[PDB]
Amino acid sequence: NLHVFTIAELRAVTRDFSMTNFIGEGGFGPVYKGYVHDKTKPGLAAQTVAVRLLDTEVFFLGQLRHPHLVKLIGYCYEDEHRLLVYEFMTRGSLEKHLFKKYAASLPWSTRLKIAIGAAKGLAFLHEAEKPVIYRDFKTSNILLDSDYKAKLSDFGLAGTQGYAAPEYIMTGHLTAKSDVYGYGVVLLELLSGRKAVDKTRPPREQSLVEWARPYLTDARRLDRVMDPSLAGQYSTRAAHKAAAVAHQCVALNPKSRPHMSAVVDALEPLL
Ligand SMILES: Nc1ncnc2c1ncn2[C@@H]1O[C@H](COP(=O)(O)OP(=O)(O)OP(=O)(O)O)[C@@H](O)[C@H]1O
Ligand SMILES: C[C@@H](O)CC[C@@H](C)O
C-alpha cells in the first residue's frame, strides 16, 4: 500500500525543502517535516508527514504494516534521489521525553504502554516472512504519537552508546537477539529514567546495564534503579517483574534472551 510521489509534489509537501522544515540528519539521511492535503493523493487522508531523503526494497517495507510501526505512506525515486514519506509522529522520539531530568510527562503507566508497544512492533518485525533486524536499535527508534503510543521507526533501512549486545560488538553478526538486547537497554532506561551510557556519572554508574544488573534481582534495593519521579506510581511487584524482563533481555548469553512476543506477554499484565 504505497503512494508514488514526484519531486514536484514533495516540494509542495515540504515548502521546497525549507530550512524551517528540516528536522535533522542521522545515519539514514535528512528528514523534513511536511503536510499532505486532502487533495494531494487519491485515497490518502490529509496529515502531517516526515520525508526522509535516503542516504525494490521499498515494496517489502510497504508490507510491514502494524499498529506499532511508523506507517510508510509512499516514496519518490527521481534523478538518483530516493525519498520515503512516513506518517509524522507528533511527539517525536522517546529520548527527547525520557532523558529529561524528571520526565514527569512520562508517568509509570505511560512508560509501560511505550514498552509494550515497542515490544509488539519488534515482535512483528522479527516474526515477518523475511525477519527484519535492526543494526542499531536504540531509544531514538521509538517515536511517539499524541497519545504517547509507541511506533518503531527506520525498520528495514539497514556500541559506544550502550545499546549493542556484547557479542554483536565483537562479531558484528546481526541476530534478532541483538535487537532484544537493545530493547532491554531501553526498558532499563524507561525504568530508571537514565540514559544507557552517561560518562558524567561516577565510573560504576556510567553504564546503566552494568550498574543496574546486580539490583534487578533485589526487590528491596530496586528503588535505587527506579526513576525517583515515578515514586508511588508502581507496585513493587510490577517494578520487579519489569526489571526481570529487562534483566532477561540484557542477558550476556543470547540464548537466555526471550523472543519479543514473550516480552509482550510478560509486560501486558502489568497494565
Ligand atoms: N516519522 C517521523 N515523525 C517525526 N519525527 C521523525 C520521524 N522520522 C524521523 N524523525 C525525527 O527526525 C530527526 C532525524 O531523524 P534521524 O532518524 O535521521 O536521526 P536520529 O534518529 O536522531 O539519528 P540515528 O537514526 O542516526 O540514530 C530525528 O529527530 C527523528 O526523531
Ligand atoms: C502529479 C501527477 O502527475 C501524478 C504523479 C504520480 C507519480 O503519483
Numbering used by the authors: 4 to 58, 70 to 172, 189 to 301
From the paper:
We identified ScRIPK, a member of the RLCK VII subfamily, by a screen for sugarcane orthologs of Arabidopsis RIPK and rice GUDK. Thus, ScRIPK is a member of the RLCK VII subfamily localized in the plasma membrane. Furthermore, bacterial growth was measured to determine the bacterial proliferation inside plants, showing that transgenic plants exhibited significantly higher bacterial proliferation than that in wild-type plants at 3 days. These results suggest that ScRIPK plays role in regulating drought tolerance and disease defense in Arabidopsis. Like the typical structure of protein kinases, ScRIPK-KD contains a small N-lobe, composed of five β-sheets and an α-helix, and a large C-lobe, composed of six helices, an activation loop, and a catalytic loop.
In this study, the catalytic base K124–Arginine (K124R) mutation was performed and the mutant protein ScRIPK-KD K124R was purified and crystallized with ATP. The alignment of overall structure between wild type and K124R mutant protein showed no significant conformation changes (root mean square deviation (RMSD) is 1.090 Å comparing 220 corresponding Cα atoms) except for the C-helix and activation loop. The C-helix was outward, away from the active center, and the activation loop had no electron density map. In addition, the position of ATP in protein structure of wild type and K124R mutant, and the crucial residues of ATP binding pocket were partially different. In the ScRIPK-KD K124R mutant structure, Y169 and E170–M172 formed a deep cavity to clamp the adenine group of ATP. Other residues, including G98, G99, and K124, may contribute to the stabilization of the nucleotide through hydrogen bonds. The catalytic spine was also completed by the adenine base of ATP like the wild type. To explore the conformation of this mutant protein, we analyzed whether there was the salt bridge between R124 and E140 and the results showed that there was no salt bridge between them. We also measured the distance of D1 and D2, and dihedral angles of the X-D-F residues, which revealed that the ScRIPK-KD K124R mutant was classified into DFGin group and BLAplus cluster. Furthermore, the regulation spine was analyzed, which was not assembled.
